[model samples]
Target chain A: GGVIATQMTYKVYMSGTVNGHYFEVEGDGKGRPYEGEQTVKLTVTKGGPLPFAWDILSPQCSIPFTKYPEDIPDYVKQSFPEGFTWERIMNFEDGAVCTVSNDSSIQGNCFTYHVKFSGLNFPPNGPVMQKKTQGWEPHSERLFARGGMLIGNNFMALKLEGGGHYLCEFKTTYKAKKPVKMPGYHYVDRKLDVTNHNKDYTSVEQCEISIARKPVVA
Target chain B: GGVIATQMTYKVYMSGTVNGHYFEVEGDGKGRPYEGEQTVKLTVTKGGPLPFAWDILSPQCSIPFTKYPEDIPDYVKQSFPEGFTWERIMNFEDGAVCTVSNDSSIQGNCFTYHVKFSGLNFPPNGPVMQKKTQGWEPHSERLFARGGMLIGNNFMALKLEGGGHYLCEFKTTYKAKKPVKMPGYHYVDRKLDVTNHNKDYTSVEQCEISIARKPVVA
Candidate 1:
């Protein structure tokens, strides 16, 4: 008797977030928007006597003395002995030949250190500190008596007595979306330099860092 | 850091109906499950005398009357004129004859008619009717007398009275979907079939048909 017809259409959406200050810099970094393999520069200012120190940690790696050579100081080596391996080192050359001193704890006035780290894998969870080697070292008998000495007993034993400053540049490679799982192999490498400023004594220090699989595309 | 994950899946349903009397042997015939081309057979028993007639009114060809001698009786010539065309006929035969009595109104009769219409296109809306022709006589006074008597002096009279039962079959071919809007096309060729029973006086009939596109595998 009569005829009728009708129809309709539908749509779908996808989204998520990247955590941490390092990710923020990567997401909204300087110069051209960073997306898929990019370089970032960061600066951490210090105004204290003790040197400002930072560590880049990977979810898959651990820090410890046993995993590394005996030359690595007990304090730094004991942090993650069997878990993670050192990917890079700065200021002091070989990770296996580095050491710390604590004899002149109040001698050094101030110093600024520039270091470059490479082969960093950026993760969606952003960057996190696996361990603060510098902060924990002062409490140890070996480092406290040595006055913040360098590895291999070759560098000066600076007692960061007052003002200290830290400055860093992070080179980042941006990716569109977050990676699915941990331990994922990413070719994009980034360098993040963070400097801390303190009113105590200041000294120069270099450490290694790593990023997770999560990436933020600009 | 932290880890997160997610997953999903989806499904759908559809239905329609058919007249019970048209497919009596198949219950309501509402859910007749069909995979591909299939034929469904049904039978109807006659309860009493049935007055039956059939007609096909498409745009194809009209009925072509059989040639008759010029010396027939007036009543016979009037009832079966040389050029008389009828919309309703007793059967699908070449005679184009009517079995209704002249005296009576051709009502109240007991007879069984086996009608079989074949080649009816399933989901019947696609084919364009190329031609139409019906088996019915023109209800005009110039052809036959009002009181069922012979008025012409030269023509002879012959009455067609009902007696034995009648059996008829119709084969129709139609398309499943709308034909391409191409020029110079004749007709679609898909086909389907339907059967009906008639009793008592011939009743003005009406049939409703529908068609749909062929389904695809999910």
Candidate 2:
């Protein structure tokens, strides 16, 4: 008895965080029309969270998708009809949410960003959707977003458990008390036009390691 | 005391995915330049499953991060002297999994494909990292990838409860149906080249009803 019945065929590749937001995915392997370029950079922390605001009956904001059909009624797609979407009712249903902070509720400050979706549902799941009022482009100061529905109806459930962050309204006292801060205190010495994306975070490493294996004899 | 506080200060946003890979989060309200994006779309079914081959002791593939420190050892960051990355060990580890299908054993195919990753991470969590070899221009394929790693050592696991299909190796005589069909099969050529994303599956069917409250206002 001498064993030699091998089987191991293959083909798959993938790679790619954080922010709390800080993004960029320029084309090809990581470039020139080679099909990729997603930008991000929005940071506002007038002393980090003193009071997380904006929800006095929609004073204006962004991000949120799925649920508009009389609300919460994919009910199991009629107990089963070979269907389930809005990306599987927002990733296998259960509290289901969308809109990573869509907007309008503006007062203003300097900004820069975009998620301009023409619309896409079904692929890894539902409503990876949004693009409120024309894909805005004048170059930076981000967000436009539009109506995102469904939480099954009558809703109000937002999250930030160590994720997205930025809530403005800083009046600039410009160091009323002596300070040698920021270029250093959370680090800030005034710098914006930074352009072409480089640091703060950008890496998708992908999958690897397993050069080869052998065991054939048939 | 029928309360009324009046508070509204906000900023938070995030969204993305993969499975055969498919993600989108074009950025602005999820900040700091932390990087993001994960793409996928390499599917071709000559008739869904006959003999998916390509694992002759491994050929070549890409995507992986973390694990190399003497293999499987964070060694507790050398007693916290200051040093730890690959994004804080895949964003504060422990059962951590990114890019959804990340990877593990794959093989060959004769396919019409895709690979589109602009960048995104930290929605629900991460690939907000990049390097652009080229942004792709010879269009007609898609793979919006994000970080989908894990492949540097021993591994084996796959999925298909019902989703994403593509299996290869096709040598046809055309149709030798004297014995009956399929030396292979799964050919769907109704072709649409369909583009432009929209429709909540059709609003999931529009907000479900009720402008607001009164199921006993939460």
Candidate 3:
């Protein structure tokens, strides 16, 4: 039996256009790795965010209404008599998992995983909306990678619970890197959709992640 | 990240002198290995038994009294009009853990673990004892190993719930092996203790285990 101990980390740099508006940001995250009899399970903790700046282009616009309560327009106040808050930042959670099989196929160390993001707090449609409260919801994606690395492009179909929908495409090349640092810049290409809130449109994203692992010593 | 999948198994051979009686047995067991952030966990399944043949010398001589109910002596039959049964075999359970540190110490790759064995169906006092049923009880031991291996002598203090007390000493060297097979024979050197049923005594045991691990591929 061969035995060894090590540490692992992730460095993400991603950008995308959601509903015709472009945005970009660096992701920060960390996690521990485990090796089972015939598989490797990575349980991530303290995951960071995918800072996108496309919310401003959305129908309601990225307004810190809660940060500036006095700036609330008459229409929004009248519609939501009980008051409301706006959230534009999405954060990652701890349930992400990456599993690798014992046998390497032609594709090489096929890796499959589930990643989730949250930070949306939408009020329900009725009496509950009168209470000035809502629950944070999550959006998740199941993805796979080959050759022992997470890279390449993935076309995604997204839908909003209240009618916002889109077909987003992302091109990414993520791998292992060190000295955890952030990557800068965003490039946009806009083509607005004729939806009620600019909620539907064709989107594109480019992101990358660098991972690092060091021997854990006590 | 250095990742490789593998399989692991254990082979145990043990013998001992418990309360002036000699006993020896081949232990059969199997388990899967898991590597956690800084530890190795072994989840054993369908674990086998440690067949020791030392029952005859107990307070009550080993006899198939239940197998030949008619041959039960008048005194025993009268003492228990409700009838009774005897069980002399011990089996292992699935809770076993072996953990190694991410860093090596003066003892090398230190490994620690817990192992359990059961199969004693003891009846409680009074009314419950009147019934023909009992619950299987377990005996467990927490152990340690060095050099990334399990091997050594452990002095154990054992106490029977019903007064069979003993200071047992076991010299065991366990490792990895293949083609699972049993070891033969028993060697004994005994010194009796003067107590009810020879229950209180100084006991010594000698045992060994061979472990094996093969890469799992599919």
Give model 3's TM-score for chain A to 2 decimal places.
0.21
Instruction: Compute the lDDT of residue A70 as modeled in candidate 3.
Output: 25
Worst 10 residues of 1 chain B by lDDT: B1-10
User: Per-residue alpha-carbon lDDT of model 2 for A1-218, expressed as tens digits?
Assistant: 00101111111111111111222222111111111121222222122221111111011111111111232222221211121122111111221112121111111221111221111111122111110111111111111111221112111222223443212221111110112112211111111121332232122112111111111222
How high is each candidate's interface RMSD, in Å?
45.2, 12.9, 26.5
- A36 Cα displacement, candidate 3 (Å): 39
**Superior candidate under lDDT, 1 versus 2:** 1
Candidate number with the higher TM-score (1 or 3):
3
TM-score-based ranking? 2, 3, 1
Measured on C-alpha atoms, candidate 3 has an lDDT of: 0.21
Q: Number of backbone collisions per candidate, in order?
A: 117, 118, 9
lDDT of 1 by residue, A1-218 (tens): 00100111111110111121221100111111111111222223322221222333111011110121222223322221111112222122112111111110111221111122232322223221221232211100001111121111001111122322111111111111222111211111122222332333122222222222211110
Q: Work out the TM-score per prediction.
A: 0.12, 0.17, 0.15
**True-vs-predicted CA distance for residue A160, candidate 2, Å:** 25
Q: In candidate 1, what are the lDDT values of residues B120-188, reduced to their tens digit?
A: 222122111211222221110112122222211001111122311111212122111222211110111
Global CA lDDT computed for model 2: 0.17
